[PDB]
Design a protein around this nucleic acid. Structure first.
Ligand SMILES: [Mg+2]
Ligand SMILES: [Mg+2]
Ligand SMILES: [Mg+2]
Ligand SMILES: [Mg+2]
Ligand SMILES: [Mg+2]
Ligand SMILES: [Mg+2]
Ligand SMILES: [Mg+2]
Ligand SMILES: [Mg+2]
Ligand SMILES: [Mg+2]
Ligand SMILES: [Mg+2]
Ligand SMILES: [Mg+2]
Lengths: 122, 215, 114, 48, 120
RNA sequence: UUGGCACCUCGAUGUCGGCUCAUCGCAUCCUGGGGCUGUAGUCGGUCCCAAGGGUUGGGCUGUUCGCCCAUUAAAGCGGUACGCGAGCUGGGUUCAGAACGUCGUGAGACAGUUCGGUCCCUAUCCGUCGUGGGCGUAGGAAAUUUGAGAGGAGCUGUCCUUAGUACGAGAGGACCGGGAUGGACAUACCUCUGGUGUACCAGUUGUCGUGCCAACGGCAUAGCUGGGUAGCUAUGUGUGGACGGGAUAAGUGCUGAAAGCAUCUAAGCAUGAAGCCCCCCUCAAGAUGAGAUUUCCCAACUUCGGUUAUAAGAUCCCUCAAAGAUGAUGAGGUUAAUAGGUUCGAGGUGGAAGCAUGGUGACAUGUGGAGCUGACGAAUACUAAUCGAUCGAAGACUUAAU
């Protein structure tokens, strides 16, 4: 469950350290998001340098919610923080050094570049 | 085709192909018999009626429902049968099958049939507008005294009455409702159960009506 | 007979291969992952936080820290996508639900052996 | 809040037609005494 | 279970003082709902008395109030000693029951269904 | 809309916005179908048909409005006392305080600002949302139904194939079809994930008490704290919208005169939409037209006036919950498993007390997945569902076939 005005850690070296969501894109009236959902968001704490800077409005994909996802075999997965990877409007990222574990459930959302730049996917 | 009566035992889960967990409602569709065959030449419509759970015979000083009365003896005697607690008609079936007295067993369905399950709801009692209907409640602070009331009930003096269909409070209620396009996943012939995929209306030990999908 | 039907129908899908564990125990869960290519097996080593209600819906939960980020993972105990469970290390706990480890990081989330 | 009109003597008596009271149990005590209330043990003037 | 029109502690204190006095006098006159609920209390407390070990002596004193019976010949036993000593010897063959509820008429101040609960 | 008029109301028609709940128009915002195009395609433009459904979330402003950030298939316009305060707020403003600007000699004033400033009502009737009783339905009952009718539903994106095909110089890029999935919504349910769970389990502080130790008990929000069954629950699980038929709108025609021709119309004959009627889902014979099927029951006294009893059937009463404000509904009432108790479980808590051992101790370990366990499951008549009482039909005429 990630809605408007949730602070998320940014899980790569795209230039951002914290980001808050404006809208959950998708359909009209869409309230929450989970792993694999793209959100549009403004960075609040930014690294000095990098690419993005404080006050940019970026699109970004959800990796590793704290209220994680359910799988077809009745399995679950949950994480200790909400994280996020800033993408570059072709489902490809801005950085090359994605941090932290990524949920498996975005392999099927054509985020294969985010998977290959990541640590162990679970 | 393919109607049957049962009762809700409860709810479990089953694993399938490639380990997929699927939720499951166990329905004990036991000791159903065909109890009266209805014809258009006598009634105007073709149906059978199935009696579900047999109860004890006629007793003279019977004070409750588990002993049948004399109209229910003679009705379930015109078929060679025991008197049943529940009796329902099924008119989607073919009337040219189902001789009167046939024990319609649990293996009329195969794993993978689409079905409709008819039952009553639970019944919640007298409930208010934001629970009986999905109404937005008022603000809980900022000075307000409107929380769980219904809102306005009309317009001022054009329509000097309240229109019907207003969605006011009252009994949430156990009323009949169908869930459509459920699957049969597993038919245990010896236990006389059906595992239907998902949840069906009603409380436990209720009454269901598993008949095949009209869609 | 009501009471056997929850049991006697779901009985042939419950498992027997699995070892005996409890919360506090370190496990090596050998979950198998099937993509469109093959039937690869990935190991998930963590500490059992929770074991809840019985039947074929027995459900356990292990906890791992992957890249500085703690990861909860929850399995049906009788699912056919766990090829093997090894009990790596026992644990001296005094609860049944170890939810206090979620706020403990580093060496403070340490659980003894036996 | 307030009644706009008075209720008549006719409308008042139509409302309180279900404002009644029922006769009680009234079973005999076969050992000794007068009528006891049904499914109750007697206290005075009876042997239940 | 019934709430009896009281708080979780006002009901608990009422229900173990009503179960103690049904050990002292062995038949008490209460209302009907308060006897439906002390029925399951004192029958679970005679079950502890039929055991008679020390571990359930400690459990019957969870419930019983500290009331002293003046028995015959000026001898005094407590309600804990009278539960494991007299009631426990009466029902050592019976597998349940231990009480009955005899309904009576309404009271005068209320329509409260009076009830004698006895110890059988 | 701004007004005009002064007709209703000054022995009161009480408040601008917002909130909650809507509802209705169509001069249509999206989706449906068409015409024309200065329409290659992709996009458009414009006009016509159409109300079925849908029509976002923030920032600033008391604001209506407006601007703006994001989205979206689209963020329609209006009416309903500028809908709705005996449904809610009271920021806006006509109250008393105070201050500035301005005006006035002044007291004061502005319709200029600024800070502060009490929101009454136990619902009689109508109307609505549920729910009973009475009587009727030409014998009385029990059960299953017909559906005259009424209500609900009705939205839509994205992607993949067709196909880089048609088209196009290129750039670009289709219809038609097929398939996959969503969003929003509506439902049912607690298996999972969770929430709660005040008669469940454990830890622990203070103080008082059970003579003391040890064990407990009271109070301290349930003293706090860690969990947690049943049940209720969503944010959790399931489904749903679909198709498909008729009749049509705009339109498109075929044949065809009147009017030798031509002509979609006059006679004919087609085709044609999220619309209309079904299809789907509920509810429905108080449908006074009171329907139908199956089974059960069958009286005499007797100016048959009525009474006496009763049938089938119920009910009182009593044990209850899958039901419930009440009552109704359902499970039962001894030939009984209805509830409690007991016994055995399930799940929960996490290792009882006592004892032993070790440690100077605080404490550890063993005895021992131990004890305990509210609603869950099974068994068991131990306790209580006692004896009883009340109600309940006798089948009207008329005519027609038989
Ligand atoms: Mg709201
Ligand atoms: Mg009003
Ligand atoms: Mg009267
Ligand atoms: Mg207290
Ligand atoms: Mg004039
Ligand atoms: Mg129009
Ligand atoms: Mg008014
Ligand atoms: Mg002033
Ligand atoms: Mg001056
Ligand atoms: Mg103030
Ligand atoms: Mg005290």
């Amino acid at each position: 469950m990630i809605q408007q005005e949730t602070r998320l850690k940014v899980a790569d070296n795209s230039g951002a350290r914290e980001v808050l969501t404006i809208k959950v894109l998708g359909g009209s009236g869409r309230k929450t998001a989970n792993i694999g959902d793209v959100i549009v968001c403004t960075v609040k704490n930014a690294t000095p340098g990098g690419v993005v800077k404080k006050g940019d409005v970026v699109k970004a994909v959800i990796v590793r919610t704290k209220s994680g996802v359910r799988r077809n075999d009745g399995s679950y997965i949950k994480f200790d923080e909400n994280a996020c990877v800033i993408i570059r409007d072709d489902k490809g990222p801005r950085g090359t050094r994605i941090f932290g574990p990524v949920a498996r459930e975005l392999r099927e959302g054509n985020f294969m570049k985010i998977v290959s730049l990541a640590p162990e996917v679970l | 085709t393919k109607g049957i009566l049962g009762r809700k035992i409860g709810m479990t889960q089953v694993f399938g192909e490639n380990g997929e967990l699927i939720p499951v409602t166990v329905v004990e569709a036991k000791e159903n018999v065909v109890l009266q065959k209805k014809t258009v030449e006598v009634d105007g419509y073709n149906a059978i009626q199935v009696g579900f759970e047999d109860k004890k015979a006629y007793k003279k000083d019977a004070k409750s429902n588990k002993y049948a009365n004399k109209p229910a003896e003679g009705h379930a005697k015109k078929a060679d049968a025991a008197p049943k607690r529940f009796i329902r008609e099924f008119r989607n079936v073919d009337v040219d099958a189902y001789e009167v007295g046939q024990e319609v067993s649990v293996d009329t369905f195969v794993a993978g049939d689409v079905i409709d399950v008819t039952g009553v709801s639970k019944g919640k009692g007298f409930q208010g507008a934001i629970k009986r209907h999905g109404q937005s409640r008022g603000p809980m602070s900022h000075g307000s005294h409107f929380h769980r009331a219904p809102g306005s009930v009309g317009m001022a003096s054009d329509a000097s009455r309240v229109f019907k269909g207003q969605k006011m409070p009252g009994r949430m209620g156990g009323n009949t409702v169908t869930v459509q396009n459920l699957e049969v996943v597993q038919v245990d012939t010896e236990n006389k159960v059906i595992l239907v995929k998902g949840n069906v209306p009603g409380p436990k030990k209720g009454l269901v009506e598993i008949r095949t999908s009209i869609k | 007979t009501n009471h056997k039907l929850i049991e006697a129908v779901t009985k042939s899908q419950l498992r027997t291969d699995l070892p005996s564990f409890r919360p506090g125990d370190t496990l090596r869960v050998h979950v198998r992952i099937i993509e469109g290519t093959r039937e690869r097996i990935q190991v998930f080593e963590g500490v059992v936080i929770k074991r809840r209600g019985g039947g074929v819906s027995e459900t356990f939960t292990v906890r791992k820290i992957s890249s500085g980020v703690g990861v909860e993972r929850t399995f049906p105990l009788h699912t056919p996508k766990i090829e093997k469970i090894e009990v790596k290390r026992r644990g001296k706990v005094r609860r049944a639900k170890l939810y206090y480890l979620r706020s403990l990081r580093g060496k403070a989330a340490r659980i003894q052996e036996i | 809040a307030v009644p706009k009109r008075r209720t008549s003597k006719t409308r008042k008596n139509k409302r309180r037609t279900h404002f009644k009271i029922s006769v009680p149990g009234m079973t005999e005590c076969p050992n000794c005494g007068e009528y006891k209330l049904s499914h109750r043990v007697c206290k005075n003037c009876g042997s239940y | 279970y019934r709430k009896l029109g009281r708080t979780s502690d006002q009901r608990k204190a009422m229900l173990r003082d009503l179960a103690t006095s049904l050990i002292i006098s062995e038949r008490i006159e209460t209302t009907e709902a308060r006897a439906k609920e002390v029925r399951s209390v004192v029958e679970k407390l005679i079950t502890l008395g039929k055991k008679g070990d020390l571990a359930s002596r400690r459990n019957a004193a969870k419930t019983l109030r500290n009331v002293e019976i003046l028995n015959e010949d000026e001898t005094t036993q407590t309600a804990l000693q009278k539960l494991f000593g007299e009631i426990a010897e009466r029902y050592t063959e019976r597998q349940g029951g231990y009480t009955r509820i005899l309904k009576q008429g309404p009271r005068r101040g209320d329509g409260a269904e009076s009830v004698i609960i006895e110890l059988v």
